[PDB]
Amino acid sequence: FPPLLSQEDMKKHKILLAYRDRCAALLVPLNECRKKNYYMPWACGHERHEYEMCEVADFQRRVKAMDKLKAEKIEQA
Amino acid sequence: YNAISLIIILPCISWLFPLFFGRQLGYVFVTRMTSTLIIITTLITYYYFYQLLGNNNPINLELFNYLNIDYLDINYNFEIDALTITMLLAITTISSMVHIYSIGYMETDPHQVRFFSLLSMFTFWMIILVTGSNYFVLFVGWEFIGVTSYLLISFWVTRLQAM
Amino acid sequence: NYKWNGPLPRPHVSAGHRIATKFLGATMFFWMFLRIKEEYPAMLGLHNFYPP
Amino acid sequence: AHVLTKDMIQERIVALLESFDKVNDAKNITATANLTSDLGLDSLDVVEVVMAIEEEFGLEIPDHDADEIKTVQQAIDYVSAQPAA
Amino acid sequence: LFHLLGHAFFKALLFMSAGSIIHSILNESQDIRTYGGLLSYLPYTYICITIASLSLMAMPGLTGYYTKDIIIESTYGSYSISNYVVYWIAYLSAVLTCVYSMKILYLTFYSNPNNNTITYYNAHESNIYITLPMFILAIFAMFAGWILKDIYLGVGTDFVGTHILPNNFSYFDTEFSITQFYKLLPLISAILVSILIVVLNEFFAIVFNLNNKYINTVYSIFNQKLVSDQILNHFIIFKGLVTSGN
Amino acid sequence: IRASFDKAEEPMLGDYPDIDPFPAQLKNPYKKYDDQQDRRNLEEPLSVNDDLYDMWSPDRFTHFKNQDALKYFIGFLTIFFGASYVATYFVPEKAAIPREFPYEGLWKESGGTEKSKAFFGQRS
Amino acid sequence: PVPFSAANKKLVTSMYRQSLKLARNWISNRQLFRQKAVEIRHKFDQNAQISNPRLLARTLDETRAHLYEFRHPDPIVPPSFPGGTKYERNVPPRMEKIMQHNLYEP
Amino acid sequence: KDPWARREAWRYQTNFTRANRFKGAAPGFGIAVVAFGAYLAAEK
Amino acid sequence: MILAGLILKLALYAILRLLLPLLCEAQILYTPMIYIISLLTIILTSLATLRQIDLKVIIAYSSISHMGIAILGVCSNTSLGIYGSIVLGVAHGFVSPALFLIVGGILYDRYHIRIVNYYKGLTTYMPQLATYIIILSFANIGTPLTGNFTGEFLSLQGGFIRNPIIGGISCISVLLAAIYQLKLTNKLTGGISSIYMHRTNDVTIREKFIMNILIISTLIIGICPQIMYNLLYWTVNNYIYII
Amino acid sequence: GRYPFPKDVISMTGGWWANPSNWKLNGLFATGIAVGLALWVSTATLPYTRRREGITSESDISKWNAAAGVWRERHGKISTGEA
Ligand SMILES: CCCCCCCCCCCC(=O)OC[C@H](COP(=O)(O)OCC[N+](C)(C)C)OC(=O)CCCCCCCCCCC
Secondary structure (H helix, E strand, O other): OOOOOOHHHHHHHOOOOOOOOOOHHHHHHHHHHHHHOOOOOOOOOHHHHHHHHHHHHHHHHHHHHHHHHHHHHHHHO | OOHHHHHHHHHHHHHHHHHHOHHHHOHHHHHHHHHHHHHHHHHHHHHHHHHHOOOOOOEEEEEEEEEEOOOOEEEEEEEOOHHHHHHHHHHHHHHHHHHHHHHHHOOOOOOHHHHHHHHHHHHHHHHHHHHEOOHHHHHHHHHHHHHHHHHHHOOOOOOOOOO | OOOOOOOOOOOOOOHHHHHHHHHHHHHHHHHHHHHHHHHHHHHHOOOOOOOO | OOOOOHHHHHHHHHHHHHHOOOOOOOOOOOOOOEOOOOOOOOOOHHHHHHHHHHHHOOOOOOHHHHOOOOEHHHHHHHHHOOOOO | OHHHHHHHHHHHHHHHHHHHHHHHOOOOOOOHHHOOOOOOOOHHHHHHHHHHHHHHOOOOOOHHHHHHHHHHHHHHOOOOOOHHHHHHHHHHHHHHHHHHHHHHHHHHHHOOOOOOHHHHHHOOOOOHHHHHHHHHHHHHHHHHHHHHHHHHOOOOOOOOOOOOOOOOOOHHHHOOOOOHHHHHHHHHHHHHHHHHHHHHHHHOOOOOOOOOHHHHHHHHHHHOOOOHHHHHHHHHHHHHHHHHHO | OOOHHHHHOOOOOOOOOOOOOOOOOOOOOOOOOOEOOOOEOOOOOOOOOHHHOOOOOOOOOOOOOHHHHHHHHHHHHHHHHHHHHHOOOOOOOOOOOOOOOHHHHHOOOOOOOHHHOOOOOOOO | OOOOOOHHHHHHHHHHHHHHHHHHHHOOOHHHHHHHHHHHHHHHHHOOOOOOOHHHHHHHHHHHHHHHHOOOOOOOOOOOOOOOOOOOOOOOOOOOOOEOOOOOOO | OOOOOOOOOOOOOOOOOHHHHOOOOOOOHHHHHHHHHHHHHHHO | OHHHHHHHHHHHHHHHHHHOOOOHHHHHHHHHHHHHHHHHHHHHHHHHOOOOOEOHHHHHHHHHHHHHHHHHHHOOOOHHHHHHHHHHHHHHHHHHHHHHHHHHOOOHHHHOOOEHHHOOOOOOOOHHHHHHHHHHHHHHHOOOOOOHHHHHHHHHHHHHHHOHHHHHHHOOHHHHHHHHHHHHHHHHHOOOOOOOOOOEOOOOHHHHHHHHHHHHHHHHHHHOHHHHHHHHOOHHHHOOOOO | OOOOOOOOOOOOOOOOOOOOOOHHHHHHHHHHHHHHHHHHHHHHOOOOEEEOOOOOOHHHHHHHHHHHHHHHHHOOOOOOOOO
């Protein structure tokens, strides 16, 4: 997980509100790489791979939170 | 040279001139002219999409007041959003290709002056419907494409089922 | 028109139409093979991101 | 485009009748020929050949004009009466 | 928006290939029961309509893959629960949009001929004005999704200035929480049902030509537009004209 | 005569021939009329409510009876919505939790102030 | 209701027309259709030797009902004909000179 | 058994044989397989 | 022409000039009854036009439905409704005498009958008359950039402010006004030419002159309704009673 | 199809198969009017164009937010959320 961007630098870089989590620090290089090229999919591939494997690490901590909660639910039951 | 203005004005030329000068220019000229002008329009909108991929900085043009009543103003304002350029390149590409297609598809039909004029007025009110920037210009294009759909589905006025 | 209700002739298509379709078909099967080739683990769905 | 003439309707309707088998034989055919009597048809394979001749020319016949083309010549000029081919 | 973009190119190619085969037949018929085989006679119309239908069936590498499939797994990777049901519904219409598409490729190019012989004598290919836009829109309906996908489906994109609420946004979840089976499923099934419908309509052709009168009643329900225009016509239009005369 | 509203205007006519209403579309197309388009001979008596039996009238389908077709249509609709609603009970549930947000769920970013956090707030 | 006649011939020639045309648009295949066409040809040939009016009319009316149930939504029509799609596209206007209604103005 | 047997022979003969009906079905497959093999060999 | 262009708008002027200044406290008590009567004369008259055998009677019933739209603009207690009723009255006084000229001048001088059943397929001998018929049909409906839509839109908005439910059921006049108008227009323009009508002259210079004036003067109000705000901005505030 | 038509009638969109003899010559006029009108509308609407972002300073919108807070302090107007 990259270091969480501070709030007024979220307002610097005009990150959309659905994109601001502790994965967003790897998103603002990406977008500007995306604006150096013209959103062309052969280019700027290293950095989107970086970002989406942040987002997988986020996804598996989400999955581990849920299976904790299912263990929690049936031991209450 | 104004990219936001040519998108509007070139299909209006492409509509108004086949009607006012159809008897004077004829079908073999007006076909090539109407298609030529829509080709130039869609080349301009590809180039504008290529430029807006550079910076996400859209352009609007402002015109005169529609109505100023007490708490309510409506203006003719036209901007190309990213959403607008997305619909715009699709509708202009399909527009220009259907124009070129109907050169050869309508070769033996009589009334193709009126046909190509109605195709480009359909294109034009679609342009206006998408590039408008209040709900009013959206309504104006929204109604005139239905009027054109009347005039286009009923192209053979002799046929009953078409009417 | 020369025959009726008997065996038809093999058709006459131009050289240019016959070249253009082989170009379009070669382009589609080649492009589809390249995009299966490069997108294979994303395309079929593999190495899924659920943790063990 | 594609024009028909009457030569063509002639050599198509006779072509249609020589590949039909329940005719008497393939050489008592001419334009003058009654399908009832000359070619030995019953009253319903004259209807099968009316169905065949209407699919052959790509046209459609109501019941009160299918009945009266009993000769081959009436069939030829009746099919030549319509603009569709 | 991305599906809206690619669908225009698809359907323009499909409507124009349909117009070229209607224009090429001397009869100018529109019933596909009257078309018969035309693969030998119309290879250019065939290859363009094959590109268009392989794209609309979302077979991969083409534009309809990227536009059409990601909606189907966005139905599953939603946050709300009963969106799972529309996962199947859209998926069902995936399979059906293969089925009729193969019909309008089989009975028009592969079948034994149904028209009279003179149409097959006079079947030729159309002008340059008809063939060139089909060429250009075939190129577009192949390449447009792979070029414009990073514009409309990045995982972080600032192009369209739409503001999704942060909980209604389910994109990061829907590309990662899908099963191997649920993503594998519409691709392989869309290709399997297509190959099966074509092989069954040639080799057997009795499965679709049964004459149970129950299946004929059901077929004529589905033929007359899910009887909707009768329901609209007699019970709203004619009813309204009778009350207006009252 | 045949329709109920045609029966309803029966006592208002006097010195008027009281035609049986027949739709102008369900006539034969191959009988030659004076107008082939309207399918009408030149002095043929017009029904009362003739514009409901004209060529320019509704299309008037032939294949189903109308009560049959209303049964089939409402059939298919309740088939779909009944299968839709029973299929919500047999669903499986999720493999992740719904994702959460920093800065106490972006409430300052979503307009908001501290008295207004529940109205404009996220998961945290 | 009538033995061998011209009017009973009229009736069942048109009925054979109708069932052939009606079987035409159900079947997509060519040889399935023509197997079926020879089959109902056989069906017509097993009859047509009935001399009764009672069961001639009874078979007549129920094959009319059997013909009524296998009816099709779309008949196959050629397009330039009144069911079709090319029907009345460019009706040529009749040659008419201008009738005039005013003494002063056209 | 079929009275229109000599009419409906051309629908099964020379151009609508089973072998000819599947001939243009994949027109550019044979060039694309070798072009793809060339791309596979030229990737390295 | 004088009747449907001026007398109906004269009574529309009289309800502003005579009633709204010294019957304010009465008018507030009675606007639900006016809304009953005006919605009920929009719907039921717009519905009764669908079964009409005669041709000038259709345009008469059209004028009823448009005046019913204008009355719930004046009785709306809103500045928008007052302005939209004035724009509707002026634009209707333009576009409706052109329709009465189409039915009574170009169509009754030539054939001297007014029944709908004789007229079919007027495009193939009279192409510019048919052009006029479709342009005027759409101008009469509430198809925008015409002045009729400006009046109908602002009057429906004022009637939505004063009572939102009768505004909701009064908004369907957009649909109901188009049904009968396009049902007439496609019958007149479409079809094979009539076997009853023998071919006559196309539209003459004076008829085209009257038509062109009455179409430009709707289009100018429809593209810019501000051109007559300079007369009305006092009188749009004058009749409002919002304490 | 080339059925005969009456030459009596004059429509502005042409008639049936309208193809005048001097369609080259008139086409040059239509070419000139179209390019002149497009060029003239192109340059006339130039100063009425502006960009979406970058027009006004952020100083402006910060102090307008401040003055909106001023206009909200003086009327005692409470939030959406607090009840
Ligand atoms: C899509 C349908 C549009 C139809 C267009 C029809 C032709 C109208 C062209 C006018 C464009 C124009 O002259 O506009 C440009 C001007 C200026 O604009 P401004 O922003 O208001 O002033 C500048 C404001 N500054 C200083 C902030 C930048 O306008 C006007 O103020 C003049 C209004 C005249 C309108 C009169 C219309 C009368 C009917 C004409 C048609 C019969």
